[PDB]
Design a protein around this ligand. Structure first.
Ligand SMILES: CC/C=C\C/C=C/C/C=C/C/C=C\C/C=C\CCCCOC[C@H](COP(=O)(O)OCCN)OC(=O)CCCCCCCCCCCCCCCCC
Ligand SMILES: CC/C=C\C/C=C/C/C=C/C/C=C\C/C=C\CCCCOC[C@H](COP(=O)(O)OCCN)OC(=O)CCCCCCCCCCCCCCCCC
Ligand SMILES: CCCCCCCC/C=C/CCCCCCCC(=O)N[C@@H](CO)[C@H](O)CCCCCCCCCCCCCCC
Lengths: 642, 642
């Protein structure tokens, strides 16, 4: 007595439009026979098979398969005692036939020495191509044969085949049926084959016709035909009235992505190129700025030559070419125009960014202004000044232009006095800036954004990898087939965490090497805690993949949910702008985001060298741990009623 | 002769592994007879049906179906004269049965009055639920029944069915076969049934057994049984040898988005939430900076109180509480500490951003410095200066603090002289900044990034919509089902462009209204040309979706390619940083990118008010036009060899 079912009541719905998928069902599968299930649709048989295996549960009734209640103690139905061929092809792509057979043998605890014998026997018997050909390269009919061979490997004592012969050649169908009737010859082997084709299940010892969630009849085909008088079976149906399984999953995980060139480029080559582009374009100071200089103290020759010469010692010859020599050569390029009304016309168009317009009386008026004091007449206060018309449409370019012009005057003022034996401190504003406590006097914007780029890449490259992996595998029936083989959900998750941990360590090493060793981003603090924080953000992002994959069943739905929170989090975590710019109400809400307090903590360890003991540093560690726990709890709650 | 195939040859794959799907196939179908095409696998029969309907082309041989070559304007195989039921369920989700019937009737050109009669007849004949139930809410059998009813509504003179009964109830199978026999007697209707059922296809008037790309035997069932002396058929087989379509497509496209709530929120509620968050967080000035002030001219009372009092007229009583009076109240908060050593300790932690430390004799040292100038002793110059220690780890905050500390001294200096009857023009540096030509003296960073945000949202939300729409729809054979119905490829492309153009028109209105009318981003240029440029970027993005959809065949691959180009373009088109920061070599390459010249053109329209006659403005219009053509050419070349 292999399988016994009594009063199996099962239904679907929410007490609004309920569906009675199952009804009062009594079914017995005698041991050592071939049992055929010939239901009309493909839902009742599938539900019954799932309940028999253990992947589903009843509402009322009992099931007694191979000795005990399915999925629990007292029996080994989920494991190496059963053979399950799913309705759909639940094979792994980018796998050779030999690799798939070896993987499934390892899952069942078989020895690798005896796997070769079964592989050769099944290749000869099922008429399959060379073992080195990948599964994805096979046709749609050979994949079913590979699935049948996988289900027939370990010689189980109960075979559950779901339409094993859909489009098999008759010369092979006869051989398959001969093998099936040969293995179940005075032995413990039992077959429970479900099919839609009525005429193909005549060789079964016992036939059970299913309709409206219950078995119409269950007898031998010969008795079924004789007691009703029908010629064929078509007329009869016209009734108007743990170590070893983890190593198997680790190899599969590290080989599924190795054979996908697109996956490797997306998760290993994209962070590297993004880091290179960010360090070469964002945060650098402008360099090719142009100015329209009008110098009326000298003759006009070209738009690129002026012949600005003077004396360096004393006597204050020109004091207009002398100032231009103190201009920063790196950022500002000088262009010469003849008239003040012509340089402004160049600024109006795109030919320049500003105008200077030194007057012809600049030298005589300037020397008469610093040598007079507070009694200077208004006339000398006008002729001794530089008139700058600036294009302030750009905020960042305007800041450099204003800063470079004023800074060059401080050097010019400190050069005039000092060359005449004076005190250079006399040309200083009373507001004196001492040595900065943190940083330097010339900070860079690329150093402010770099901590926000490291954490963003690692966080969002784990959401995409985890959500895609757990959705494709589940929707293709692979997770359900690798559970029947005895792989508990505990080791499915454990093997995924280890696989994701390794790839998030390789990404962290590549990002940190290309950012600090190359392009010279400063790291004042401890590098050990930087690595730990970066890894911790990867696990937080990975835990977000669990929530997304447990909510969305379709791939396209998950990406919208993942992309629908990627953009808002970037604009609220203070990655590209200081967090002090937002309103006070919006500032409080943003501190509770997953990436806000972690970015600030990482920015302090890189720009200031703060240790773990500082309150602003370990707040980023506690914020991630809370979000990791919160993400895990949400996923469990979602799976409770789904 | 309904169909005449002679000397058919067809090859698939490469030379190394050729695939001879057909080889010297001779087949003839009479008019008014049911024809059954039984085969071992489900690929050669599908290939033959695809060749018959005209989707494919033979490498050698001729086909004459219903009068002439398929799709040659001599015969009307693509259109009303055929009934096609694909192997897969090529139906539209979120469509009621009535809506599906109406859409397919409008495609064929039927009147809405006679579609109702056919719908009511087919609903009762096929035993289907109420017409208001959505297709996606039906089971597999009901969906297949709806697909079968779709092929029977317009009454074609040639029915092509691919496995019409795979899980149909036997009573319904008998009814369907009775109807099929009824419609083909004493008439011109011809039915070609392709099935794996060897025994169910017995009522067909002519059976053609297919094997190895050719027909083993083509004759009547009972004739075959009598000639070969076999009881059943499997024993014999066991031998060892034009505006109505656009209006129908436009309504389908719009209604396919209305019934997807997630899609509407992703393309119409995400840009609204992204614009609002960007305008409230990025670009605004910091307004919470705290400074640790050490004033030794007044007694220490609290950390929040100092009792800063001074005379406003003259006599220069304190000059330390007077300077602090001019400090801006918006950005700087005042804290008081008793010792300079106790103030730096607060800056070293996260309690302050700087220190000031006015000396105990600041008033007399400063007063004696202005009155006695150009000859002040080093003692006075050292005890009349303010010592500022700044935390310069943040570039944007450090700029604000330095700028506000020096701008406040100008107001203090212009108040000290002027209240004593002196001209305030004596307290200005010779570098005099006139009125800016463009912008103002206080620019904003959110105005620099706003032009780049508008283009990025519109361009990159059309790639996602176009690629997904053309990939999911093509994967499930929806294009193949509408092509057989008579919908030319031109009408499919035209209807999608119109639908996308209307979608991108709504997105432009929402983005422009919130950014300009609500958040007050100035538009100094022409508003008409801004809308034109924004729309032109949407078409350019859509054409990039054509390239992605023509290259990739799976959803998970298109987005990796789509996201693989979204990240680099953001860091190379100068959206979040001026293009002047990159090196010259990278600057030349980045110019040719799709969004580089367009962002510059839009920025000059909003920030400067330039018109279309300026070279820097219309260069972004030519860049989009060329990229539109290039993307269309690439998509045609991709489909040429693929
Ligand atoms: C903004 C616009 C910028 C520029 C404009 C345009 C340039 C022209 C368009 C150019 C695009 C170029 C090449 C595409 C080519 C061919 C793909 C189709 C053939 C087969 O590649 C399979 C599937 C798809 O094949 P599929 O049909 O789905 O698989 C079979 C399904 N049964 O491709 C994928 O996944 C690609 C996954 C992209 C990963 C994204 C991150 C990339 C990081 C940097 C890349 C570094 C490259 C280093 C080279 C290493 C060589 C080993
Ligand atoms: C970084 C951390 C950020 C935040 C911290 C978070 C705490 C909680 C995270 C919570 C997120 C979770 C669940 C949300 C809820 C429910 C979705 C799943 C239920 C049912 O939604 C069906 C499928 C799923 O069903 P599906 O699998 O696709 O279909 C199968 C067919 N049989 O969802 C989809 O459409 C995903 C498409 C998301 C569209 C993105 C739009 C982004 C802008 C939104 C603007 C404001 C929205 C206002 C709401 C108005 C409501 C009318
Ligand atoms: C399965 C997909 C799940 C997605 C989950 C995460 C994505 C996965 C890859 C992460 C690799 C690294 C993840 C970011 C790596 C760091 C990149 C960065 O930091 N970028 C910022 C500069 O710091 C950027 O400038 C700020 C955005 C401003 C413009 C926002 C308008 C764009 C919206 C347009 C809508 C298009 C819709 C889909 C388009 C095509």
């Amino acid at each position: 007595h292999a399988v016994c079912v009594r009063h199996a009541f099962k239904q679907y719905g929410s007490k609004k439009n309920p569906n009675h998928v199952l009804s009062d069902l009594n079914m017995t599968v005698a041991k050592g026979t071939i049992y055929g299930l010939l239901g009309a649709s493909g839902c009742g048989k599938t539900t019954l098979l799932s309940c028999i295996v253990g992947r589903r549960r009843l509402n009322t009734g009992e099931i007694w398969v191979l000795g005990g209640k399915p999925g629990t103690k007292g029996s080994g139905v989920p494991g190496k005692r059963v053979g399950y061929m799913p309705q759909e092809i639940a094979l792994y792509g980018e796998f050779s036939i030999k690799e798939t057979m070896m993987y499934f043998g390892w899952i069942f605890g078989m020895e690798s020495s005896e796997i070769n014998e079964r592989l050769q026997f099944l290749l000869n018997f099922l008429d399959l191509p060379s073992q080195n050909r990948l599964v994805k390269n096979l046709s749609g009919g050979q994949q079913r044969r590979v699935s049948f061979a996988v289900a027939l490997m370990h010689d189980p004592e109960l075979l559950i085949l779901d339409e094993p012969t859909v489009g098999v050649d008759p010369l092979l169908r006869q051989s398959i049926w001969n093998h099936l009737v040969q293995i179940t010859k005075d032995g413990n082997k039992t077959v429970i084959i479900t099919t839609h084709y009525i005429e193909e299940a005549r060789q079964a010892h016992t036939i059970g016709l299913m309709r409206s969630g219950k078995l119409l009849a269950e007898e031998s085909p010969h008795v079924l035909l004789s007691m009703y008088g029908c010629q064929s079976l078509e007329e009869v149906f016209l009734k108007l009235s743990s170590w070893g399984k983890i190593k198997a999953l680790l190899q599969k995980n590290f080989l599924r992505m190795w054979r996908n060139v697109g996956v490797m480029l997306f998760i290993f080559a994209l962070p590297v190129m993004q880091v290179i582009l960010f360090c070469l374009a964002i945060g650098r100071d402008p360099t090719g700025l142009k100015l329209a200089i009008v110098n009326h103290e000298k003759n006009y020759t070209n738009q690129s030559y002026q012949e600005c010469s003077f004396d360096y010692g004393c006597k204050f010859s020109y004091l207009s070419c002398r100032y231009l020599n103190n201009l920063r050569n790196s950022t500002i390029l000088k262009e010469y125009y003849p008239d003040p009304e012509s340089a402004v016309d160049a600024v109006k168009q795109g030919h320049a960014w500003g105008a200077l317009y030194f007057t012809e009386n600049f030298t005589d008026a300037l020397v008469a202004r610093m040598a007079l004091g507070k009694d200077a007449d208004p006339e000398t206060l006008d002729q001794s000044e530089v008139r700058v018309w600036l294009d302030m449409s750009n905020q960042q370019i305007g800041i450099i232009l204003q800063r470079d012009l004023q800074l060059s005057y401080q050097d010019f003022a400190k050069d005039l006095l000092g060359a005449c034996e004076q005190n250079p401190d006399l040309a200083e504003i009373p507001i004196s800036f001492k040595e900065p406590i943190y940083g330097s006097n010339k900070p860079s914007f690329t150093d402010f954004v770099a901590p926000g780029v490291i954490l963003t890449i690692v966080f969002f490259l784990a959401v995409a990898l985890t959500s895609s992996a757990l959705i494709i595998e589940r929707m293709e029936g692979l997770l359900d087939r690798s559970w029947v083989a005895g792989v508990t959900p505990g080791e499915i998750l454990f093997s995924h965490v280890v696989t994701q941990f390794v790839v998030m360590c390789g990404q962290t090493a590549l990002v940190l090497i290309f950012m600090i060793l190359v392009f010279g981003v400063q790291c004042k603090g401890d590098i050990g805690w930087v690595i730990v924080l970066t890894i911790l953000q990867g696990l937080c992002g990975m835990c977000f993949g669990f929530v997304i994959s447990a909510i969305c069943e379709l791939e396209r739905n998950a990406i919208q949910l993942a992309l629908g929170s990627f953009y808002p989090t970037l604009l609220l975590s203070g990655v590209i702008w200081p967090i002090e710019g937002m309103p006070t109400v919006l500032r409080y809400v943003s501190t509770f985001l997953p990436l806000t307090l972690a970015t600030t903590s990482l920015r302090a360890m890189l720009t200031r060298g703060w240790s773990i003991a500082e309150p602003a540093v370990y707040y980023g560690f506690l914020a991630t741990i809370i979000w990791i726990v919160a993400f895990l709890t949400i996923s469990m709650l979602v799976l409770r009623f789904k």
